[PDB]
Amino acid sequence: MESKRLDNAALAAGISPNYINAHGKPQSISAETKRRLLDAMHQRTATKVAVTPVPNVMVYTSGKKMPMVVEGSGEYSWLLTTEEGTQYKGHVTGGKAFNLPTKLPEGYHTLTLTQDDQRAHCRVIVAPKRCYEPQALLNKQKLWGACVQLYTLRSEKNWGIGDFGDLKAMLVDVAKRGGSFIGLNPIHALYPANPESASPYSPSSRRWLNVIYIDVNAVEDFHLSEEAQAWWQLPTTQQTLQQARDADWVDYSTVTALKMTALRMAWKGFAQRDDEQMAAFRQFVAEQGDSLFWQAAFDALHAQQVKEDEMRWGWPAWPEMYQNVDSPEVRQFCEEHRDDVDFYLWLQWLAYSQFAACWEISQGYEMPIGLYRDLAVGVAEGGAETWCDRELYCLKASVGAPPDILGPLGQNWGLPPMDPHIITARAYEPFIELLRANMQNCGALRIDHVMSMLRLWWIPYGETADQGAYVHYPVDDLLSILALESKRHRCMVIGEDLGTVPVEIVGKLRSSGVYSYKVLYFENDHEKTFRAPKAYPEQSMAVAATHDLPTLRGYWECGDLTLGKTLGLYPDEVVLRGLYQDRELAKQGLLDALHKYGCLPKRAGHKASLMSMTPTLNRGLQRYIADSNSALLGLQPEDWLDMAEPVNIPGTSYQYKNWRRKLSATLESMFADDGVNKLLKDLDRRRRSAH
């Protein structure tokens, strides 16, 4: 294809023809990038031989006219069955639109037109305008919660990694202190056969759960299996376990080896049940269908593959015969090793159940939100999701971010993008299942990179991010479906919207009931004048920091910059000097603002370069966001413990032990501490004085 033909095909496929570059100038995408992203997509060539009477899907907002346009000509008879079962019938002529019956309920309906034999179906979705909000926020209350990295939690009972047992126990302590929720890192299924690949942000699947979180103590068949107690009783077992627990860093390998060994024995007992339990399990499997089966089959197969060779990190590294789920050899494996598949099914049932148990406690204590999950932006190229539904993803591209003024190289996130053409061709089925998997048993959901609904930066496989382009998604339809599912689950939505958001979309997100995300470190203008607490928008969540950033102490001590220098991340000493100065001005403006908006004692110093971190300053930084007009406050425990050390350093691969740094204290210890209890009672009061 020559330029101008291609230019049109690209445009019609939803590929934006340009972007604002790192010098602020608009820049055209190359013809090569266009060629390669078209080839990456899954479009069907239209024959226009008798194009369809109505589209395969239509989305409407409730309380409005619903003009449905009908192509062709001659009389068509239409049947509209609601989700509830209600039937509407009529006739219509092609080339003339007709309005759907008014006052249709929200949900998922089916319109069917008929002429002679020929039937056409259209999924008709009726959505509310806004996502759901708890009564507490409708009544303008200001709530707070703990935002934790689940794996970092220490306790007297766990096996060397925070898990659902600890989550359940922490819900209680948080709730007794006026806490409204606990927020989580993404708990998406990862790789038990490759436990050391621990980033929650390259998951196997975004529908299933990370099984390392199972609380083995809570598993009845662990206790009943003689074989398992013999194993638990070994001195090498109790020594291995003690060391895993005592370590300051999560040993994923060891903990995984311990849990799988124990659970494999527990399974031998469970597999013989003929009771409520086995009934509940088998019904779970049935209701969840093939997506679950392929997840379990993946993990079962992966377990074997690492034995043959430990470099088989994912499916693209497996012998090619195992890269197709319908091959004779995958079929053979599944018949023969059904028990193994069954085992991994059971693990998902345990994780599901235990997460439900946590959710049930939070509602017992009447927490307005209770549990607050995080949905990563995509899946890894070599996990279970792309393995069994390859059409849905475009493996010849990676999602990332473009070059901009802040980062002139841009980023590559290494995630194959979901294909917008398949999303729509399947009537949004994959977007619905994704929300249904991530909204259940919880009262809030965080959408990583909520801009993903307008567009993503697609990079042709194995190229630098400058060779990318923005590829668009049906934002309106997705924002409607988001609202609909949000309301159906009674699960409010927080849209992570750091970085650039076109003004247009800020508006849509706000009126769609999505909550904004605000980080203290970033909420200052170019002059480091910090935003006033009362100017934080009502419809937002306020946090001091995130897992990608320094803790309050790390920030204040420039520990990120210093440690960064130590690990080779800042080779350019000029750029580094800039970042120090930039930090010191940031610190000064922040200190000015703490004093100004009444977060500190009178005696506290006013010059920031002379100050080190103290309990008073630690408290002040948190009061600042607690006094904010943001409806929700997220507090890191790392900051209650006054921890200096980060949990992830973006840009590192091996240089830092990312996703491993444990909290410096256990739950029991933390919640028995005077300072912690005083801090939280102060902060909880500050939320109450904020109206």
PDB file of C-alpha atoms in Angstrom, residues 7 122 139 250 274 322 376 383 410 500 532 548 582 601 607 691:
ATOM      1  CA  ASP A   7      -3.504   6.667   5.802  1.00  0.00           C
ATOM      2  CA  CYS A 122     -28.486  -6.866  18.412  1.00  0.00           C
ATOM      3  CA  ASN A 139     -24.044  12.291  52.216  1.00  0.00           C
ATOM      4  CA  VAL A 250       9.510 -12.137  50.746  1.00  0.00           C
ATOM      5  CA  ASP A 274     -19.062 -36.142  49.214  1.00  0.00           C
ATOM      6  CA  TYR A 322       1.842 -27.023  23.640  1.00  0.00           C
ATOM      7  CA  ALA A 376      -3.965  -3.828  36.346  1.00  0.00           C
ATOM      8  CA  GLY A 383       0.275 -16.261  30.513  1.00  0.00           C
ATOM      9  CA  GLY A 410       8.701   6.854  26.462  1.00  0.00           C
ATOM     10  CA  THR A 500      -2.074  13.839  30.947  1.00  0.00           C
ATOM     11  CA  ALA A 532      -4.707  23.592  49.318  1.00  0.00           C
ATOM     12  CA  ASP A 548       5.959   3.228  42.572  1.00  0.00           C
ATOM     13  CA  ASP A 582      13.859  19.818  42.300  1.00  0.00           C
ATOM     14  CA  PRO A 601       2.922  23.015  65.856  1.00  0.00           C
ATOM     15  CA  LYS A 607      13.287  25.804  56.677  1.00  0.00           C
ATOM     16  CA  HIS A 691     -17.190  17.817  57.063  1.00  0.00           C
TER      17      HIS A 691
END
